[PDB]
Structure formats: structure tokens, C-alpha cells
Enzyme design. Sequence first.
Site, PDB file in Angstrom:
ATOM      1  N   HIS A 209      37.961  48.167  30.400  1.00 38.36           N
ATOM      2  CA  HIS A 209      38.551  47.541  31.531  1.00 38.36           C
ATOM      3  C   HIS A 209      37.821  46.238  31.866  1.00 38.36           C
ATOM      4  CE1 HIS A 209      39.985  47.349  35.722  1.00 38.36           C
ATOM      5  NE2 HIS A 209      38.776  46.849  35.925  1.00 38.36           N
TER       6      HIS A 209
ATOM      7  N   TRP B 166      28.462  45.926  26.085  1.00 42.78           N
ATOM      8  CA  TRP B 166      28.556  47.361  26.303  1.00 42.78           C
ATOM      9  C   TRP B 166      28.607  48.002  24.908  1.00 42.78           C
ATOM     10  CZ3 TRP B 166      28.149  49.338  31.158  1.00 42.78           C
ATOM     11  CH2 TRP B 166      28.434  48.497  32.234  1.00 42.78           C
TER      12      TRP B 166
ATOM     13  N   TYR C  68      34.353  52.291  31.129  1.00 44.16           N
ATOM     14  CA  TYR C  68      33.468  51.556  32.079  1.00 44.16           C
ATOM     15  C   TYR C  68      33.043  52.448  33.206  1.00 44.16           C
ATOM     16  CZ  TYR C  68      31.980  47.439  35.083  1.00 44.16           C
ATOM     17  OH  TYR C  68      31.251  46.478  35.756  1.00 44.16           O
TER      18      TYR C  68
ATOM     19  N   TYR D 293      36.056  33.416  35.538  1.00 47.46           N
ATOM     20  CA  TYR D 293      37.328  32.953  36.124  1.00 47.46           C
ATOM     21  C   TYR D 293      37.464  31.409  36.078  1.00 47.46           C
ATOM     22  CZ  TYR D 293      37.204  37.725  38.113  1.00 47.46           C
ATOM     23  OH  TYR D 293      37.081  39.058  38.239  1.00 47.46           O
TER      24      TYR D 293
ATOM     25  N   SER E  12      43.093  44.605  37.827  1.00 45.72           N
ATOM     26  CA  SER E  12      42.562  45.781  38.600  1.00 45.72           C
ATOM     27  C   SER E  12      43.122  45.678  40.051  1.00 45.72           C
ATOM     28  CB  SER E  12      41.013  45.801  38.512  1.00 45.72           C
ATOM     29  OG  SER E  12      40.335  47.012  38.948  1.00 45.72           O
TER      30      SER E  12
ATOM     31  N   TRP F 227      29.787  40.433  36.910  1.00 45.76           N
ATOM     32  CA  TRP F 227      30.674  40.746  38.012  1.00 45.76           C
ATOM     33  C   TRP F 227      29.995  40.596  39.361  1.00 45.76           C
ATOM     34  CZ3 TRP F 227      35.132  40.638  35.712  1.00 45.76           C
ATOM     35  CH2 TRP F 227      35.303  41.245  34.425  1.00 45.76           C
TER      36      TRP F 227
ATOM     37  N   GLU G 163      40.583  51.923  29.137  1.00 45.74           N
ATOM     38  CA  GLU G 163      40.462  51.655  30.569  1.00 45.74           C
ATOM     39  C   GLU G 163      39.481  52.520  31.345  1.00 45.74           C
ATOM     40  OE1 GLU G 163      41.720  49.527  32.614  1.00 45.74           O
ATOM     41  OE2 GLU G 163      43.196  48.445  31.413  1.00 45.74           O
TER      42      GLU G 163
END
Lengths: 529, 528
Positions: A438, A430, A328, A129, A199, A82, A325
Site C-alpha cells: 500500500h 521494505w 504494511y 507528492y 487511501s 510519510w 495492500e
Amino acid sequence: DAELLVTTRGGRLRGIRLTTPGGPVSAFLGIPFAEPPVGPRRFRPPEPKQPWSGVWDATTFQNVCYQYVDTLYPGFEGTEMWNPNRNLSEDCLYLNVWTPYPRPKNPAPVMVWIYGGGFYSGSSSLDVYDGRFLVRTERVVLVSMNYRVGAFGFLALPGSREAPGNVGLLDQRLALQWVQENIAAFGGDPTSVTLFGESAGAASVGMHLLSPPSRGLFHRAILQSGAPNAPWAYVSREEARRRALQLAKLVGCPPNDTELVACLRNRPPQELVNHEWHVLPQESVFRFSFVPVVDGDFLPDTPEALINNGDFKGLDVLVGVNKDEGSYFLVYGAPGFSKDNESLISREEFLEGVRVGVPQVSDLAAEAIVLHYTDWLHPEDPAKNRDALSDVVGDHNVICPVAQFAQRYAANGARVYAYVFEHRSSTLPWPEWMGVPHGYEIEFIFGIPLDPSRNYTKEEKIFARRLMRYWANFARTGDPNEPRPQWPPYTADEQKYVSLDLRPLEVRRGLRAQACAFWNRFLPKLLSA
Amino acid sequence: AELLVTTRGGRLRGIRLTTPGGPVSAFLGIPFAEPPVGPRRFRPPEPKQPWSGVWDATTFQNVCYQYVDTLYPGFEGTEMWNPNRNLSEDCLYLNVWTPYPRPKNPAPVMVWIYGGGFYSGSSSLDVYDGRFLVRTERVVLVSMNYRVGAFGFLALPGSREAPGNVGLLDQRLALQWVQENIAAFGGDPTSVTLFGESAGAASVGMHLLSPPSRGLFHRAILQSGAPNAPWAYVSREEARRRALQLAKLVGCPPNDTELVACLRNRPPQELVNHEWHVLPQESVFRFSFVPVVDGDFLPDTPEALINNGDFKGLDVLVGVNKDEGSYFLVYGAPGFSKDNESLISREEFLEGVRVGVPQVSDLAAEAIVLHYTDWLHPEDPAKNRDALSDVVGDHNVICPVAQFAQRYAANGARVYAYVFEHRSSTLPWPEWMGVPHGYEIEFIFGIPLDPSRNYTKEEKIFARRLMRYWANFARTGDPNEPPQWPPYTADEQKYVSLDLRPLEVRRGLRAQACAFWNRFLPKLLSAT
């Protein structure tokens, strides 16, 4: 070079050929759509890009909006994927178009992606993306844009023409205008533009639906794990003024609006970013400093108000959330929470984390949440306590705002399709206890599993193609189904939604109806007294 | 003889009663107090002075003056609770049933305290017939009339003319009479198991919480009631407000001495005719004259007392029925009635909450509506109907019994817990009401063993198990003998269902619901 030189209003562009196992795509990256919002243009709305002359190279991505770099877990793939992957800059208002090679005989449906990142982060350039696979598989034209974030995109001294608020959303709007004026040259159909986002991207999509000057710029919408009417998605005039003043204080500015903004404008961006987080009112999770503001222009009223008062007959909308959700966010300041172990918290830590996860509510409101999210036969079970805080933060920030959004859109005349996404990536970095967190549907929507360089499973490739197909069917027709197991519309009476994972679609009723009754009906009466 | 027995008050003569299992000697109408009449109205009871000669005890005596229910005239469902003897303030008689012949050895003793919301009741009702339990389990059974209504519970706290709690003192005095005399009837003063239902159960709890009731019983059984229930007691201030209102309603002028004097000179029917109208709102499951917190019989509120551990840690057996709330709803909740399925509207549900949970804030109603709505289907009449029945039955019976059971177990007591789920074959109430409040008693009392009644083969078998459970509890503190009924503990909260099928163990008595009533709701009320 056939189909790599295209003429647009701003001028001639040169694209690049990208490859996929299913064949080639023409990409045009780093297309300028605004004059750089730099120096005296900081906090100002964006202005269209003046015609460059000659040929603008569009083969690489451009600078990413100056923003915070996450440091919770340096080197960790789960966070770094991210983080920005290009140099940071205020000169960042560029967009990307992927189209099939050759371009379709017939004008093709356009999907326009708006990234998330809490309005504090993100870029159209992230690996996740990458538009090549949706485009090749479903023969859709796809656009994405950079939009300003943090103070640069949402700091507001409401009433001023020098920092009016919402300029990041205006960035998005101007990109949408560029699409209307230009995608035909890429084979795209301007009369069939489907916005989608995740989001904050999804909240952004909500706001375009409700902002009058955006509404002729797209036709259908998709909101993934977000809604404009969420407690983190917007802020009042007064609270945005208070935070603006507080950043001005923190970056060294002396204690009218003109002189305050002039001072903000002479400070370097790193300095703004260094102080961003400390303008919030309490340590918390799932809150962000500079978000859209209810300004009486882009948003004539609160999203709650505008949604309640809106007529949506013959609007098609698709919305959803992931199974887990809240998880995280908990590693970012809930005590006892870590990626590095099963985060089996104690009861005291649960009680504490309620005040982080739901900040700025009475002790009585906390009492009410604790009551709802406790198994009262087994109040000391560490596992149950961990999952319950996850639900608290999930329900409050994402699921309940999406459930209200959906009930209200159906009631006021929209066809709505709604899902919960329940497949955990085979490749997920994770730990097991965060479940399907999420953000982790996006790579399946974008068809990343088809990337031979990555190591998804045979079934995951099959699942991505189903999802791409649902999303692209929605974009073509407003309905994610075709002749040949149905996804039925969510109505306000029955509240049907579908689970998406490796198994076929399973129809269920009511997105956490009991729990959302708590957040959506009861809790506003409590606070209000 | 067998039927001529000597007690401290004098000689009695009883009556041989017959059962299918054989005979029992019953002594009915035994005075244990001086008639609480004239200047003694509202006063503590005084022990009955020795009568001389032989007191005939073959006959039930008068019932305490009380309201007669008139909701559904002639309906067996209501009339079976109504007075079945002449009314009088001279109503302080108790009854003893023992086997014929008497037991060779000192028998366990079970003492019954009828319910009736502290406004009604009597030991003479068909359904509290002791003959089958005595015969079948070789137990000695006692039941007493105690003063109800204003006569037993009107209080002007502080005063000696009307101190409060005299209905309870009537019970204490009876229990004392049991200490001093059941030996003569073959019973064992060292094994006295106290049991009662609804208000009677609340009563039993009050005796467990009251220091002056201290060496009077050894175990206890609370059916469908708890002393810490919100209908069960009232503060000094509220009691005073209500005794003053009654005085005004009977025409007295508006100095505790003069007010009680005036209350004493009116006739009892005049007191009963204004009884409901002293309540602060139109409601269900609220009664006008109930125990008062006096600092004497009740040192503090029952809540405070159990929460603090101020009680005798006696073995207890407690439980509830499946549809506690349904009975009460026909007494004023809009859309309810025994004569249809009572498929209420949602607006009727919402008014219903105000009636069923009287005198709480708007915001608290909201919190109840939240908890007791299926929000997928907030419009279904059936669900709204059943949900108000849960609201009423949880608030008033089930969660008070849970809190009572938690607190007792945490302080080291052996606790057994049940939910009774068998709906009688002969039940006059409609289906919808399910297994209502009161309809386990006939089973505990072994009524299906009565050849003149119409119960199933299975029902008689059931009845014998329950008397067995109850009576094994009486003898030992444990209802089992060589599928277990396990102790309720505060960690695991185990309880059993009782119906035709064998015992099925389950966990937590509406734990989620009762967390709302016991933890959340109080914090909310005290922030307003």
C-alpha cells in the site's frame, strides 16, 4: 520573474521556478485558502482567507497540520517518508499549484491531489507528492492542499455548531472552490478538474462525489487504494460522540457540548495528539480515531446508502489497488510481524492477528474468516499463514470496498476503469515479503523516477511515463487510452481490470470476486443476527 | 457333489454357474434367521433352527418388503435397483459363491452389504452377481438380505418390542453365520473383508464402530458412504417421532407395547405406503427409517465415536465417484430431470439448496450459496446445475468419507482412498450426470466380463484391475502387487483416480469444501 507573479482573488502571489530534466515548471506553494483554524476556530468549519494586501511569497511550503509522528522504526525511510517534514501547526490551511512554463496557450486540465494518512496524518509537502514531473511531462496544472487531520479535522459532537464533524473534508472543499475561482490565472481549466487521491485521500474523493455541495467543483475522479465505503473510512454520530468524549476525558476535561468543546479548545495541540490513539475501542490495525462522520449534512446518509441510491450517468471514474495492500499494516500490531525478518508466523499468531486485522466482530465471524483464508491442505505453513493475514486485511480494508464501489458505480451508470498495480520499486526499503505494498504506486504516478537525484531504472522511468500518461489521459478525456494495447472499462457483468507493471497491460476479470463475495454479501448477514 | 455342502443348519444343494473364465458353485437362498414375521416384526433376528434334510439353494429367495421406485417406469437406470423378486417379510436369506472346484486352501472371504438408503435393496439384483469376481480372483463371496424400511429400522428407543437397528443385526447375524460355516465352502473365517456401497458402506462403518460386531471381520471397504453421514443415522428422539408418525399414518391410535402391537397387525404394504411421509420436510438424500443411536449397537453418534477414536483400527479402503450428487437431484430438486441438460435458473439453484440440505437455518443456506457460487458468473445454468450437484454430493457423501478417512488415519490405520471417474459405455443416465453414485459397482463385480453384455474391450480390462485392487486388499490389506496406490495419511491426504488411464495420484478430497462442512458449518448451527 515572467509568469511568477500572478493575481488571484485573495491577492498577488510570487511563485518560484522549479527545474526538471524535461524543462521548467512554475510553482506557487503555501497559498493560503482559509483563515487559520486556530483558537476559537478549532473544530469549526474553515472560512475563506481574507485578502492579504500586496504580494504574498509563495516560494516555500508552509506548516503541516498538527499530527502524530510515527515512531515504529525511527530513521527508517519506509516510514519517515510519510512523516511530517515541516514544523507542525494548526495554522496549516495552505495549498500548492504547479503549472508549466510558459503557461499553455489553451486552458489546461487540472488535477487535484488529496493525500492519505488515515485522516490522522499527511501533508501536501512530502517529497513523494512533488508535482513538477506530472506537470512538465503531461502539461496538466496540478493542485494539492493541506487539510486538517486527527481531532483537528474530524472530531465531532454531532448536532453542535461548535464541532459539527467533517471539517477536514470542508478544508478540501474550500480548496476546490478556490480552484474554481482562481486556477485560470495559472492556465488551468476550471471546467476540467479531476480529483485524485490515495487511501484516505481516495475515500475523501469518494465523499466529494457523494456530498451535494461538492459535486459542481470537479468532473472526474480517481481513487487509488481506497473507497468511501470502507470499514475505516467513516463512523456514526454515536461513535464519533463517544470518541470525542473519551479524548476530552483523556486530556483532563471534566464530564453542555458548548462547555465540552470549550475545554477541548483551551488544551494545546500536542496534548490532543498525545491521547488520540487510546480513544479507539480495541488495539487494532487499519483503524483511526477521527474520521469522517455520517452527519446528515456533508454525508446525507452512509456512503453505502448514497452509492446504492445514486445516479452516475456520464461520470468517468478510475479506481485501483496494489497487489499487497495488507502487508504494511501488519507490522503495526499483528503478532509475529516485522520489517526485519521474513515474518514467518505460527498458526496461533495467524488466529490472533485475525482479531487485530478485523476488530469488533463475533468469534463466529472470526471463525468464518479463518475458514476462508486457510489452505486446508497446509494450515501449518508459516509463509501461507503470513500471506493469508495480509489478504484478510487487504481484502477487508481496501480491495473489497473498492470492488463494491466499482460494481455499484458501473451499475448506476458510470464508465469505470480499474487496475491492480503490481510493480515493486527497485528502491523499496521494505522487505521482499511485503510485496507491492500500500502506498507505493504514488511515486510512479507522480513521475518521481524522472528525478535524476534518485536512482530508479531505465524501465521504471518508462513505466512512470506510461502511468502519468494513463492518468493524464483520463483527466483530459475520461478515458486513459489514446489510438496507439487497450484498457477496457469495468462493467458490472464482466468486471474487467488491468494489471499495471513493466510488462504491457494484461486484461483480467473480477477483483477477488470469491473473496469479496464473502466480505460484501455473506458477512453482513452473519453479524446481522 | 461339489454342490452338496453341510452347515450347522443342515445340508444344502447349490448350482453350478458358468462363466467365460470357468465355473463357480453358487448357494443361493440360505436361511440364516427365523422369518422375522408376526410377533417378530421389528424384533432382533433369531438364528434359523436346523432344518432337516436338504435345503435347495439354487434359487434366490424373496426380497424384504420395500418401496418400489416409480419416478421413471421401465427406465433401466432406476429399474436395475428395484426389487426383482417377490416381496416378503420372510426375506432373511444369504448367498455364497465359491469356485468349482473349491480352492485347495482356505480362501479370502468378501461379504457384500447392498445399499439402497436403508429403505430398499436386495442381494438378488443382476448387478451384485458374484460369479465373475469369484472366478476371476479365487475369492469366496457372501451377500445377505437384511431388513430395510420400517421393518429393519423403525424404533421406539428403550423398548424391547422395537429396539432399533435390526437391519444391522440381520447383517451381524449373517456375519456370524459366515464365521461358523464358510470353512465348509472353502473360505477362511480368519480373512473376512467387509464391503458395501452407499447405505451398505455406512453399514460397514457401523460395524467397525459397534463393539458387539467385534471378531466378525478383518478388513473393510466403504464405497460412496460413511457411517458419519448426515443421512446415515438418527437420534432416539427423532426415531421416536417418526415411528409415532408412521403409526398415525396407518391409523393406529396415539403403551409402547400397544403402539407396536398395532404396528404389528397392519400389513407390510400399508407400512410401505406411508413411509416417505414421515420425513420432517420434502427433501432429497434423506430416508425415513435408518440406524438409530441406541447406546448399544451404536454407543454414540458415529461422529462422536470416530472423533474420539472409539473403533477397530482395521485396514480400510474407501472412496467416492466423481458426481455423487447428480442422481439424487432428479428426485425433487426443481428444474432437474434425466430427459434434458437440466439447465436450471438461479432461483431454482436457491430453492435447490433447501431441498438438498434440508432443515437448516436461513443463515446456513446463505453460507452454502456463498461457497457454491462462481461469483463472476452466478447466472450460468450449467454452473448452477453442477454446483448444486456438488452441494448435495459433498455434504452427503464426500466430506463424510473424508472425515472418516482422516480420523481413521490419525488413529494408526492403513487407509487407501479413491475417486472413481469412469463413466460406463452403457450408462442409461444422461451426460450431465457424469459418473453418478452406484455406477462403479458393475465394475467391481466384474460385470463387463459377461459375454451377453455390451461393454468395451477397455472396460473389461479396467474391470480386471479393480477386482484385482479390491481382492489384493481383501488378501493383504494392500491393493498393490509387484504405479503404486499409496496410503492415505492425515498430513498428506493422498488418493487415486480409477478409470481407463493408469492411476494418477492427487491430494486432499475437496479439502476446501470439506473444511466448510466439517469445521465451519457445525459452529454456525450451534450458535442458533
